[PDB]
Symmetry: D2
Subunit: 294 residues, 4 copies
């Protein structure tokens, strides 16, 4: 099917900032490039959670969208996250990413307020109507507190422009049901640490923050698992989970950015209120980098 066009493995693009929380355009270019050339991924997921997107103004997000695309070739896959509590902004950001040639939009489920399902649905439908691009639903119950049922996915997936879902719920019974119920829809998993379990559950790819530094083992996990080399794939998951668990204990986005500064990348700073990497973790992280050759 054509709904599997955007299959494969994406870096959820991190963003470097200066002291005043402004995008460092030069390090951004480098991080994009690092994800394609060094990590060998199929594409970038731009302005997602990992890019500190929800801390940004509209101009900043356009800035990220623009530099990301300029920074890669025509054959690279590009998904633009335009979700926002401000639907006018979401539509604005959607038209903008679309006119730039991003292959698909996506949008986090509306959050903060307890939106009814019907409100959630027409939020997606409205971005679609006004942009005419393909749309990937970004189901993330850990950050939003919003869960979507099988019946609700049926209604959503009945829209010929809702091409699939970045799936985040820690539930493999639900993953399996969705997989069986929507076999020609696109499913990308967003739990780096359960990449192997997602892969055997038939996901079409994955989107991840840790693939910015560990994209190579991720592709082995994904290929070894589909080739039935379950054991070798799983061993790489152990390896990948030492890395993920370690990086989470130190604060994931600044820490990943730090692993990149070690490759000689201008990885700048997180945007406040996120704090910079705590040096009291320097030794422990050096030991991690050497161990896994990061």
């Amino acid at each position: 099917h054509h709904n599997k066009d955007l299959k494969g493995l994406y870096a959820a693009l991190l963003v470097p900032f200066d002291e005043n929380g402004q995008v460092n355009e030069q390090g951004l270019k480098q991080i994009a490039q690092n994800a394609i050339e060094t990590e060998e991924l199929d594409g970038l997921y731009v302005n997602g959670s990992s890019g500190e997107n929800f801390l940004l103004n509209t101009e900043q997000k356009k800035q990220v969208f623009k530099v990301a695309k300029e920074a890669v070739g025509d054959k690279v896959k590009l998904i633009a996250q335009v979700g926002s509590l401000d639907l006018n902004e979401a539509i604005e950001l959607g038209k903008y990413a679309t006119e730039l040639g991003y292959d698909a939009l996506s949008a986090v489920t509306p959050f903060y307020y307890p939106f009814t399902f019907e409100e959630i649905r027409d939020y997606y439908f409205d971005i679609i109507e006004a942009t005419q691009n393909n749309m990937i639903i970004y189901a993330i119950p850990d950050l939003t507190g919003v869960n979507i049922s099988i019946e609700q996915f049926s209604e959503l997936f009945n829209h010929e422009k809702i091409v699939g879902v970045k799936y985040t719920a820690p539930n493999f019974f639900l993953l399996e049901r969705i997989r069986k119920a929507f076999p020609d829809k696109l499913i990308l998993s967003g739990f780096d640490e359960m990449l192997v379990q997602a892969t055997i559950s038939g996901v079409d790819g994955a989107i991840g923050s840790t693939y910015n530094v560990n994209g190579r083992r991720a592709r082995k996990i994904f290929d070894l698992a589909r080739q039935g080399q379950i054991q070798e794939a799983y061993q790489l998951q152990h390896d990948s989970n030492d890395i993920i668990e370690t990086v989470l204990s130190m604060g994931i986005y600044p820490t990943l950015k730090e692993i990149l500064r070690h490759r000689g990348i201008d990885a700048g700073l997180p945007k406040r209120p996120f704090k910079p990497f705590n040096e009291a973790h320097r030794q422990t992280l050096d030991q991690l980098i050497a161990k896994y050759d990061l």
Copy 2:
């Protein structure tokens, strides 16, 4: 320069200001002016909580939030207390809004707890400190676990409340044990409760006042509940709470922001629409609503 800038006590009852929008999500300025005046003149409230949850703030852009602050302010007398909710996931935005509200003469800022990301406590703390340091205004911690996922502990309240510019808290956790502790541990800080439907329990727990969306339509009952409970007329206070919770329950089952704005249309106010993705009031609730306005004189 040498202007006698009077420091209002922030005690009392506030409307969390509702905002009316047009078909494209832009602010209806005359609608807003009427809504603010209804809060003061008809509902007899002490002040306005501006750009809060109830005002659909987290759906707006920076310019629109600036707009709301300006209109609400220009629409009330100088006796009226104003609190500016400037909290936002974009800290540059919050500082900007905070300087802007402060230059307009808003009596305090508050900011919701940073949400969405699992921010550490040291991150939440410094978010507040950074707003304070850039605005130099008094700050009220907006503590809302039901919308944010963020709870705050007693030891952490001590750390925040040790900043002389953190003057108090907008309290919404449905926990009357923690409220009591906080009340006793911080006797000279300001506590304003945010659960309309538990105003009576909050009042007897020693809160200094309250902020609510429903006060926009039930502000006179609220006052009665507040005053009677403190005057020891406990039974009459609670009976008025039975009535209030009738209203609150009904309005919650219909979509609270649109419905309250619809109760206000009915008084000739230009109540417009909510901002999408909120849907407009569903006409199927109409008759049930008319029954409620009639039984309760809204």
Copy 3:
């Protein structure tokens, strides 16, 4: 004629020997202290607070029988006979009724995800086999079970479901239930919020800390109903120092340690509850002196 069940009740605490057998002598002592020293209206026997879910059927009968023996005929007696084993619940309800207990009460079936109609008919069945009055015992904090407005209606429609021991931390739902069922007995079970429950129109309360703080609690309840609210709330501050302290040290062992300071043979908790930790003793002695316990 039936008694008026309104009032203040101790959730009765139970002393154990080194083997988790009941210490009958100390039990009588704890019961007597609740009525004579703490001036409470009744006992609620075999509730969470008496470590009842740790007990076998014979032990629960022991406690029923000792409690009743310990007190005068004017003393209100409510029997918690709820149990995952419905046959057991029925056997204890009948046993407690034949003893003269004024009402039965029963926890919401828990552990399994029982459907509401299952929860309903557990109550209706206990009632039908015992023919005593029943009090729904709702504790979301321990069971993870919530009961909706509509669900209380179904239950309360039954003439022999006479009320509810309420412990959900939700004063909106308390108020709803209060408005809708003015004919039903509401007893609250959160000591640290007795003032809030009192201004919300509860007909009394059941608590474990009233075994040591029953006098302040009566005052909180009386003062607040009489609208002397500033003073009730101040006694809640005081009561909450006690509750918070007791909570942080292991509430049931600590409560029985306090009772122990009064000459009561309050023995041990039943394993796997661990006994009071000596490292807490100085801080505990400081509580006893401050509030004269």
Copy 4:
């Protein structure tokens, strides 16, 4: 015996008074082994309606199940209970019968400290001298076990493994690699294939009483790298599991067994019996998957 393998969480048939039906029980037990080709029985678990039973009933269930099956059959006795004296008495009784290991649910209802939970295990082990499997079930109890707590527990040589039911494959993978020499049995039937490629040594399940064969294929194929076929069988098994959950799991599984000529009797109240409004739908599932 090696404790590896696939177990039926043994269902119990009752009469109208919630008394055990011993003949039906012998039959359900033999069905798991002879018809379902399972390695063992997990006796008096949640699926057995254990927590609705009295002490003597629990003993009756242990006795019937053991006398029902051959010596080569693996047997685990769930003895956990809030009454530690009852757990110790049942663990002694099940050990004297020859049960290969004990397990005990995490103590629940009350907010026990971890230290209290630890010593509940250690005391049971001390008095029984049998091996012990921690039955950790956050869905039913509200208790999660952290990785550092596992280590304190698994440091005991007699705590041989864990029946793991937390729906968290991050935590499972951490435990799998922190305790390569411990036994891990997964208890979520609907995620058997994810558990298998995560290194579980086998699994315990109520639905295996009717779909034990497919489950064996899921286990075997997945370990063989036959990943697509294993996952397909999980789709099939998940149709069965979903349907069974929507109708009342214990009574419905017992209805499937009754269709096989087994005296599956009733659930113990307050569980209600199978609702006949589900019969057509249940008949169709049985026709479709040859149950």
